[PDB]
Amino acid sequence: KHMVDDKIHSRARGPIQILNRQPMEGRSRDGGLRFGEMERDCQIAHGAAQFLRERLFEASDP
């Protein structure tokens, strides 16, 4: 049952939640992916602090 048209999604500045101005959840509501805690740790490890600022502030909810 796991087809790739059912699983593909991308997103760019689409619908935004009302409780906080972060993107939606899930591909059915055109939501974006979660940049979770472990990715925050991994980008600390890279030392990409401008990329980490771009993810966690600018391209999520400025």
């Binding site: 049952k1 796991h2 087809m3 048209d5 059915s28 055109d30």
Partner: protein, 822 residues
Amino acid sequence: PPIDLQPPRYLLKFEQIYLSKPTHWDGAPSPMMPNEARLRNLTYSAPLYVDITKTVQLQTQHQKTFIGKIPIMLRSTYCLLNGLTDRDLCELNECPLDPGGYFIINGSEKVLIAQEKMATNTVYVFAKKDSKYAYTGECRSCLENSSRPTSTIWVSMLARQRIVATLPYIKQEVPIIIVFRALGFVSDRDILEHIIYDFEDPEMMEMVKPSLDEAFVIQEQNVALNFIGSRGAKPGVTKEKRIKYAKEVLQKEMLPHVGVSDFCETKKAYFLGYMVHRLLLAALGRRELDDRDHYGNKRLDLAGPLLAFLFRGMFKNLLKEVRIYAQKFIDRGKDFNLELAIKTRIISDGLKYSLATGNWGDARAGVSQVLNRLTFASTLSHLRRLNSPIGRDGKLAKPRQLHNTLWGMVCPAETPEGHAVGLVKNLALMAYISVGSQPSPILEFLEEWSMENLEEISPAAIADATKIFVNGCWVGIHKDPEQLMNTLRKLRRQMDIIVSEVSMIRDIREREIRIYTDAGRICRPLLIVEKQKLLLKKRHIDQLKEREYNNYSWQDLVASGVVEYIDTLEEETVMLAMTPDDLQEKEVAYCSTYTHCEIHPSMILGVCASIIPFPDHNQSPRNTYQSAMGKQAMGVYITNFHVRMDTLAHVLYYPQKPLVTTRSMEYLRFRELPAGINSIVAIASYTGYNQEDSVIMNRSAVDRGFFRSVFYRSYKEQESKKGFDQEEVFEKPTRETCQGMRHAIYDKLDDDGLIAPGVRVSGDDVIIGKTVTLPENEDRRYTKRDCSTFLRTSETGIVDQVMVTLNQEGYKFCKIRVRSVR
């Protein structure tokens, strides 16, 4: 109990129940076919009538008063399509391939997952190695056909060597000798007669001696019951009303399975003596400890016990509401109106909520799951699924492991490999859960033979004879255990008195014989081996090949004394031949004392592990992973899929039966609704696109229809007649008239706001034109707002078919099934 109200008294009593056929209505009584109940999101539920009798005395009876609607699982004896021929089912748009066993609740197909539990009324000895107790006994005592739940008594030895008891509704650790004195047994010699059955082993008497010497201060029944009533969950006022609360606890709270009556003092005393004696044997090690995971120690609550446990509380709540109504309408002096007394929503909406949601109460969840209709294998495997009640995310392994007593009753391979390994299981093929019968013919048969009851014995002849139990409760003693077990088996190989499901177990090392007649035990049929020969002779195969002619069924072979159902307790006392061609021929002999023979070893597997070719040649994690994937394969999941408005239907163009098949696929009907295509694989390193678990496919084969599937998705929407402030209605919305209308194509819609079938739609195309009115259209020029369901974005396809109907509420209601080939 018949409820009584004190003024002239009157009592209500309910005596004879009536269960009609499922029927919908406002409207006239008409038989609701279950596919109609699936399509209009109805609830396939039969109404439930009962007669009333009231005495005020001035009695009046009230025949066939409507209690309420209870749901019916399909292919029952009270469904409409019981026993119908396959032509008749295909006239009803129901397929004959569907096994039933699921409820239709609001059009949704629900499956009651069988829930494991510890076996009731059975003494267990466990070791809390972390607590202050060395060995703790317990007995989850629960009387059959009793509205009250189980009430576990604990009898536990302290680790330091006194023995105490945790009783129900009593918060302190009561000593054992206090409870025996509180049952009217004042002598230490008499209590020691009820506990230790031999006075010639001084070691066990020396071990019970400190617990006996704890409570030599309290000697009277009065003082003992006073100490029982001290530190209750409901504490006592004085000497008065605390003697009665303690008498109530010893009468009605501990051990209801040995009886709740005034003469049941000594029976309860004998069974508590048995609990303390088994705890002493565990503290000696003369009997081993008990396993929590042995499946002779468990029961399976199926839909019968689950709906019974639900209906106890809901019928009691309906009685409580009738009592509230009668308390209101006697104090006005008038007479109550009984049809307004019994409100039907408390007995029907509760069943509908507990089956529709799965929150099993007003407690636990996940009991009624939505039926999985991707594959016929997934549908069968969802109807044969057991749920361990142990919660998830536990770091321990012993409730999850494959215990030895899962042999033949439950599949070893099939389990969800996520965080529910081993907890959720799938039943084996020939295993069958005993639906349970009444113990009373067995008790009459035992009193017919020379069994001596507990209220008529000396406590001296107990240890030289075998203690005999029925459903846990100890019914007496018998002197000659052989020729009793031969007689009970001789009656089960004939079905004279004892039902085939009922199980005898002679414990031979410790002199016990226990007969279980519970509802929930899990058995499987085995052949029967006299001296070293099967009883399955050639004439049975000759009469059994010629079925539909001789009318010689399986049940005639159970009646012939050839096969019989063995449960898990009785597997501990059986010598089981694997196959007859090896294990009745003389060799350097292994045992030569076989009692039963396995029918075929392939029947130890589940329904999804039966479709695996050569699964003994695989590795066992691979068998588990295929058991997961076989529930997910696309295929023709049902025969009437063109009628069904299922959400997410995956069907396949050209499914094939396997060239390499098992014999057991003939019985799952996998060659009739298959899932997958025979393909000429090659196992080759190649260009490098089959690298790390991927496969190279043939484009020309795929262009010839190879695994080209088709994915259906339905879309339901109804309008809502409300209090005039917002009013949905299906219509084609207009840009100049409607407000908030999203930028999409609305000329695909027809004149009623729906798509005609055979129309291409894509992502964010409208499928249902629906407009809801706006209350401030007068409070200008801008009226009713768009509330439309679009096609699900990043999907596309042709609208397969559209049905238009009325719902349960009488409101217009449309379903649209949209087809997309894959």
